[PDB]
């Protein structure tokens, strides 16, 4: 390296490298290019964390009730604006779910609200609610030696 002196080194190896090693330019004309191809499969489905356009609100105007600012109080006040309840039925199944459990979570929820007292509401860990929240679904963790 210390005595190195260049003398056509690059030129020589450029002359020994196949023409297949190149960066040929292709003229780019957006008039002759194709549209992107989209994947195929089942139709895409909603994955927001909350409803968007299909949402419906229960509203109270100029709220004044005791606890204005406390979420669950505001929530009770909003609920109170709806008279037209009826026995919940399932009308569109979660095909991979235990649809029964969802019905029961709602019924549990509504009841627990109507009965609630205080500012926060924590629900009982029923079997239907556990299921819906993946309670115990983590596999039990073991040493490899013991399950190999």
């Amino acid at each position: 390296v210390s005595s190195f002196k260049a003398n056509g080194n690059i030129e020589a190896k450029l002359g020994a490298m196949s023409e297949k090693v190149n960066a040929q330019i292709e003229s780019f004309d957006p008039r002759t290019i194709r549209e992107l191809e989209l994947p195929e499969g089942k139709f895409c489905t909603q994955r927001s964390k909350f409803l968007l356009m299909d949402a419906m609100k229960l509203s109270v105007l100029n709220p004044a009730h005791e606890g204005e600012g406390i979420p669950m109080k505001d929530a009770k006040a909003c609920l109170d604006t709806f008279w037209g309840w009826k026995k919940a039925t399932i009308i569109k199944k979660h095909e991979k779910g235990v649809n029964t459990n969802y019905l029961m979570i709602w019924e549990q929820l509504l009841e627990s609200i109507k009965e609630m007292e205080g500012k926060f509401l924590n629900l009982k860990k029923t079997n239907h609610l556990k299921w819906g929240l993946g309670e115990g679904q983590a596999p039990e963790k073991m040493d490899f030696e013991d399950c190999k």
């Binding site: 390296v1 210390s2 260049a6 080194n9 690059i10």
Partner: protein, 736 residues
């Protein structure tokens, strides 16, 4: 009508609305679980690109080492590591000839640096592979561990405090028959074999890169240990010193300075061109830059750059490339397995991959393991080729620039020529010539020359157009740089340092963006409003007259009801927002100073408060931020230290581990350092120098402080005697 935002581009040039193509209002991608798959991927690909080279078994580690240098020339456009020593040398010689005296100067500066650098320079890294534990640790902790284990095994030249002496210890440590370390079962002494130790010394730990934008799929990064880091540091310093004097280098200049340099290069180029020449620019990127760089080539570069220099320095700088030629990669955390039938899950280690049954793995991973098996050595993978991500950014830059440097008319004497700018693997190449055929030939000459030195232009990532517009590392040029405000969107929020630091950072971000990224005044005003709301919610410091309920409401309400001049309350104390465009550069405490009840002000700014955790001048009013793109940056901010300058609690997970003992060691160390500073306050500003023990210095200082205090009358004669007495008792107690 269906709304389509992309249709704006029918009227507005893409660069002028580029901001909209950056979706940086959402969470960036993260890996979950192991990176071992990504590590195997890079190991495999790196060998694949060099596969037609020569295999050898390393005499010291037993590692299988692939050498593609001076290998067969590329035969197609696939990424190649077949770099040719003589071609690299020609390029570096070309760089020497274009810049007489540059190598000599950069060497001279590097030598001075080697003489002056303190061992503690290595504390400046982030997470570092710690061979004494076979786990990552903070850089300073990793340094201390190496120093301690070295001295217990008889290496202590580093006691000099000089980095170069620590470097000597490192090389000398490889002669040891069996390096002793201690593991925690209580405490057990473990003896590494000479081979074990060397393998750990040559290790880069690996993990996956999180929070990287713009990519579907993840990749692996690496962290070297302390044996490597001191040597790499000096190679990269030398390379930096060179890059600073190359008109074609994009490093280490940052944002505005980088843009100024690029604009100058275009201006230069155009002045040097004739009016009859065409000019095209490649917006350029390279395929798998790091995997196709080669330590053997870096060794050549270092020897050639340092030609004529003292042999000790040449050999010292050659260490980093040699170590990289002999490196191994830890394979990461392994994999997890699951049994549907038995609802269970388990962790296997990377080390298990040497000999685990292959039935557990998907086909892809089984193939990876099969390929990697012949490389595995005491739990690691041999990786002679490649450099791994970002290890020699500057030296690799020197290689790319050397190709740019070739494009001078008086060297080529062709119907074309080129110049440009390069930063790592990113480049803008400007090619000039009389006809389009000249441009094509020039582009082919540049591309093929790059191939001869293991630089592989990414065909699918690069494009070409007539000079006037181009992109360079997310800077868009349309006859001059335009703004890209969206790059910065993630920095608009609450930084999470503390209440004082965050107010200052938040207002500064707005201001900086008004100056640099065309953040208009109305949006800047709205940015102030949005920041203040987020700060108030984050820190639960809603204005004192509001009726939100938090754990802080009652105490802030009292402060409010009791305050006379409410306009003087800091926002974090439930006060109003004072900020508008005109005062963004004024620290809140200054801005409100004249409006503060004197008692609040005297409390807020009480220097005796227990909240502010001062440490070091050099790290005062410094935050770390992670930009959307690129490395972590230190951020200076302007703020008065108050009770709002507090420190959040530390992680406690280590309490549940065998490493909990470390917490105790830290506490002891800190206690010793704190008391030291009660005797040497200047040590918080600059680092104190000396071979004297901490205790001896404190004793000498107490005595002579007590004597001056006596004469000057700050202290009684009784007090004074007790001080000298306490000193004598300490003197004595120090003899068991």
């Amino acid at each position: 009508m269906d709304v389509n935002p992309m249709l704006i581009f029918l009227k507005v040039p893409v660069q002028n609305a580029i901001s909209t193509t950056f979706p940086y209002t959402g969470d960036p991608p993260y890996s979950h679980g192991t990176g071992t798959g990504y590590t195997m991927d890079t190991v495999i690909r790196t060998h694949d690109y060099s596969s037609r080279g020569i295999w050898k078994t390393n005499s010291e580690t037993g590692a299988q080492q692939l050498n593609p240098i001076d290998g067969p020339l590329p035969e197609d456009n696939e990424p190649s590591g077949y770099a040719q020593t003589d071609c690299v040398l020609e390029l570096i010689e070309g760089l020497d000839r274009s810049h007489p005296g540059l190598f000599e100067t950069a060497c001279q500066e590097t030598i001075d640096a080697i003489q002056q650098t303190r061992v503690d320079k290595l504390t400046q890294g982030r997470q570092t592979y710690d061979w004494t534990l076979n786990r990552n640790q903070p850089a300073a902790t990793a340094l201390a561990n190496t120093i301690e284990v070295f001295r217990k095994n008889g290496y202590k030249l580093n006691e000099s405090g000089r980095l170069i002496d620590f470097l000597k210890d490192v090389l000398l440590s490889f002669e040891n028959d069996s390096m002793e370390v201690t593991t925690h079962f209580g405490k057990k002494r473990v003896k590494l074999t000479k081979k074990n130790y060397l393998i750990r010394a040559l290790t880069l730990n690996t993990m996956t890169k999180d929070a990287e934008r713009g990519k579907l799929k993840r990749r692996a990064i690496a962290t070297p240990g302390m044996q490597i880091r001191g040597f790499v540091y000096f190679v990269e310093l030398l390379a930096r010193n060179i890059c600073e004097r190359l008109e074609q280098s994009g490093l280490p200049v940052g944002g505005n300075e980088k843009k100024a340099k690029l604009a100058n290069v275009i201006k230069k180029m155009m002045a040097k061109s004739t009016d009859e020449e065409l000019s095209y620019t490649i917006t350029g990127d390279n395929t798998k830059w790091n995997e196709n760089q080669n330590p053997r080539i870096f060794l050549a570069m270092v020897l050639r750059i340092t030609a004529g220099q003292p042999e000790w320095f040449r050999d010292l700088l050659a260490v980093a490339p040699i170590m990289f030629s002999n490196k191994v990669a830890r394979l990461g955390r392994g994999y997890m397995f699951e049994s549907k039938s038995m609802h269970l899950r388990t962790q296997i280690s990377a080390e298990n991959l040497s000999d685990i049954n292959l039935r557990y793995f998907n086909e892809d991973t089984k193939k990876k393991i099969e390929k990697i098996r012949h490389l595995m050595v005491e739990g690691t993978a041999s990786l002679s080729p490649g450099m791994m991500m970002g290890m020699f950014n500057m030296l690799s830059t020197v290689l790319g620039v050397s190709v740019l440097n070739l494009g001078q008319r008086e060297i080529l004497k062709r119907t074309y020529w080129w110049d440009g700018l390069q930063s790592s693997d990113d480049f803008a190449l400007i090619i000039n010539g009389h006809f389009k055929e000249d441009i094509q030939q020039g582009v082919n000459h540049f591309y093929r020359t790059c191939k001869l030195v293991g630089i592989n232009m990414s065909q699918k990532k690069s494009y070409i157009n007539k000079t006037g517009t181009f992109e360079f590392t997310s800077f868009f040029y349309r006859y001059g740089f335009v703004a890209n405000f969206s790059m910065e969107l993630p920095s608009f929020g609450v930084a999470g340092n503390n209440e004082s630091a965050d107010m200052s950072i938040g207002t500064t971000v707005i201001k900086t963006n008004m100056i640099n990224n065309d953040l208009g005044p109305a949006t800047a005003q709205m940015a102030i409003q949005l920041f203040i709301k987020d700060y108030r919610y984050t820190y639960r410091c809603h204005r004192g007259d509001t009726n939100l309920e938090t754990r802080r409401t009652k105490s802030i309400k009292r402060l409010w009801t009791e305050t006379i001049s409410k306009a003087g309350l800091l926002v974090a104390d439930g006060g109003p927002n004072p900020y508008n465009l005109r005062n963004l550069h004024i620290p809140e405490v200054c801005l409100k100073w004249s409006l503060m009840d004197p008692d609040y002000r005297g409390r807020l700014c009480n220097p005796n408060n227990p909240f502010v955790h001062h440490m070091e001048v050099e790290s005062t009013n410094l935050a770390v931020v992670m930009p959307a793109h690129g490395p972590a940056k230190s951020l200076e901010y302007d703020a008065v230290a108050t009770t709002h300058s507090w420190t959040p609690k530390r992680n406690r997970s280590i309490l549940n581990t065998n490493q909990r003992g470390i917490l105790e060691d830290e506490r002891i160390y800190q206690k010793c350092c704190q008391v030291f500073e009660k005797f040497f306050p200047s040590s918080t500003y600059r680092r104190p120098i000396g071979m004297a023990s901490m205790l001896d210095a404190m004793l000498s200082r107490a005595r002579i402080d007590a004597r001056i205090d006596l004469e000057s009358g700050r202290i009684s004669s009784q007090d004074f005697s007790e001080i000298t007495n306490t000193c004598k008792a300490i003197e004595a107690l120090k003899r068991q």
